[PDB]
Amino acid sequence: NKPSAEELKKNLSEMQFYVTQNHGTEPPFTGRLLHNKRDGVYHCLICDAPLFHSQTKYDSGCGWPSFYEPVSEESIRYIKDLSHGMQRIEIRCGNCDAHLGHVFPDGPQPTGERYCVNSASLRFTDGENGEEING
Ligand SMILES: [Zn+2]
Numbered sequence: 001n002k003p004s005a006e007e008l009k010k011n012l013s014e015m016q017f018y019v020t021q022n023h024g025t026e027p028p029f030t031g032r033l034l035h036n037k038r039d040g041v042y043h044c045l046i047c048d049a050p051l052f053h054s055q056t057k058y059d060s061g062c063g064w065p066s067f068y069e070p071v072s073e074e075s076i077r078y079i080k081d082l083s084h085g086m087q088r089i090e091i092r093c094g095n096c097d098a099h100l101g102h103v104f105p106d107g108p109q110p111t112g113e114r115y116c117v118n119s120a121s122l123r124f125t126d127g128e129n130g131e132e133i134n135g
Contacts, residue, residue, distance in 0.1 A: 001021070001046055001047070001096050001097070001098065002046055002047035002048075002095070002096045003046070005021075008021065008046065012045075013120075013134075015120050016045060016120045016121075016134070018120075019099060019118045019120040019121055020045060020046055020098040020099050020100075020118075020120070020121050021098070021099070022099075023083070023090075023099050024099070024118075025101075025118065026064070026118045026119060026120045028062075028063030028064065029063050030119075031064055031065055031118065031119025031120065031135060032119045032133075032134075032135050033065050033119040033122060033124055033133075033135045034064065034065055034119060035059070036054075036057075036065075036124060037054075037057075038054065038124075038126055038127070038128070039054050039055075039126075039127035039128070040053075040054050040124055040125050040126045040127040040128075041053055041054070041071075041124070041125050041127070042054070042057075042065075042067075042117075042122045042123070042124050042125075042135075043122065043123045043124075043125060044093040044095065044096060044098055044100075044121070044122070044123070045098065045120070045121055045122055045123045045134060045135065046093065046096050046098040047093060047095050047096035047098070048123065049075065049093060049094070049095040049096070050071045050075065051070055051071060051075050051076070051093065051100070051117075051122070052067040052069075052070055052071060052115065052117070052122075053071055054127070056068050056069050056070075058108060060107075060114055060116075062114070062116060063116075064101060064116050064117060064118060064119065065116075065117045065118075065119055065122070065135075066107075066114050066115065066116055066117070067114075067115040067117065068107045068108050068110075068111050068113055068114065068115065069111045069113065069115070070115065074094050075093075075094050075095075076091050076092070076093070076094050076100070076103075076115075077091070077092040077093070077094045077097065078090070078091060078103065079091075079092060081102065088102045088104070089102060089103050089104075090102055091103050091115060091116075091117070093121075098121060099118075099121065100115075100117050100118065100121045101115065101116045101117040101118050101121065102116050103115050103116065104116060118135070119135035120135055121135065122134075122135040123135065
């Protein structure tokens, strides 16, 4: 994490702490940014590192914000995840290790990757004016 664990517990909503710090998943189809179509950048809620640009976002129908690639190779950390009786690849913020979601091999071209990401893990910075909203 970029801030102290004390600052996070006091500034994060219960859902945002659960997702980013406790490896939780926000309920499917409830994320604030699920159907956002505005131009801008999705940053890590915790440390504000850029993670995904709006141009890579698409409507997968899977339950959560979906992107086909991150802004850079080093932006994301990949971990084997056996939670929930499944075998998946967990994605975390490469800078602060906040939990983001998972990556799947069923995405569109060119990557063929679906980056499944909790709205609660993201801060969206609007390309029109720099206005920021927490997911
Ligand atoms: Zn981060």
